Amino acid sequence: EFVTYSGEESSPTRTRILSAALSPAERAIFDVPIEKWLSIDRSSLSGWKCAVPRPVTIEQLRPVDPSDAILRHIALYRGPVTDLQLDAIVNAANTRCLGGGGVDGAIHRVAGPLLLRECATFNGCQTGECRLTKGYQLPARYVLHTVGPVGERPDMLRKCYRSILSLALKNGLRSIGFCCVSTGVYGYPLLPATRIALGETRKFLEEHGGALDMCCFACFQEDEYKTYEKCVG
Numbered sequence: 001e002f003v004t005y006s007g008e009e010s011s012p013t014r015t016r017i018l019s020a021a022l023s024p025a026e027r028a029i030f031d032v033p034i035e036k037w038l039s040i041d042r043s044s045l046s047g048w049k050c051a052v053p054r055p056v057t058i059e060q061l062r063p064v065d066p067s068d069a070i071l072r073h074i075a076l077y078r079g080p081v082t083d084l085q086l087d088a089i090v091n092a093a094n095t096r097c098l099g100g101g102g103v104d105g106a107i108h109r110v111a112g113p114l115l116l117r118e119c120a121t122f123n124g125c126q127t128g129e130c131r132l133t134k135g136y137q138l139p140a141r142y143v144l145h146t147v148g149p150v151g152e153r154p155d156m157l158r159k160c161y162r163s164i165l166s167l168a169l170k171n172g173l174r175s176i177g178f179c180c181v182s183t184g185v186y187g188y189p190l191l192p193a194t195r196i197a198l199g200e201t202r203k204f205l206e207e208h209g210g211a212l213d214m215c216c217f218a219c220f221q222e223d224e225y226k227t228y229e230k231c232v233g
């Protein structure tokens, strides 16, 4: 059984979303127990498709240093997080966790409407916490929806990364595709955030050796790439 929230536990909107009719094929996908989604052959569901035409597999990722017993498990990817075929990818969401713009809107677009439907089953997400859902039409199996702080709040951003890494550990997920949380419209300075991102990930990797195969940092913008590229050296 999975741990699907990292914290401790509009309303008409969610009831509305949940009352919409589903096809039998859609209902079948949505009914798959969350713990079983990791290993299922998703093409046994007649209504499933991957909405990304050429996903990026873990064998196509470039470790920063295969020699290093830490950096062999970190990689940088240039492009959108939704491309990565990993156990989970990270969504930079908001309190309501009912979609929106930026990466959040992109992840809901690619995954399809069942993602929103799953998000409507629970009561949003607190800043610093993380919700686990299936990822439907994404090549990735799960989505880890975290809510980043608005503005530079280092303790909150650190919490986001620990919450993500925690649910990955508690549920036996071995790869994670990250996006650069809070550094878009939430206006968290990119360099301090990147240092926190890589910092927590390194710490975790040292404290839980062998727990993760790969932590991929997806850089949607060219500067995001270069920033991470040097912050890892």
Ligand SMILES: Nc1ncnc2c1ncn2[C@@H]1O[C@H](COP(=O)(O)OP(=O)(O)O)[C@@H](O)[C@H]1O
Pocket (backbone or CB within 6 Å): 079, 080, 081, 082, 092, 093, 101, 102, 103, 104, 106, 148, 179, 180, 181, 182, 183, 184, 185, 186, 187, 219, 220, 221, 224
């Ligand atoms: N359409 C998109 N596809 C993929 N990634 C995106 C898209 N839009 C924004 N991002 C990325 O998501 C990360 C967070 O940005 P944003 O979506 O504004 O979230 P936040 O509200 O936490 O800043 C950034 O790295 C940004 O480049």
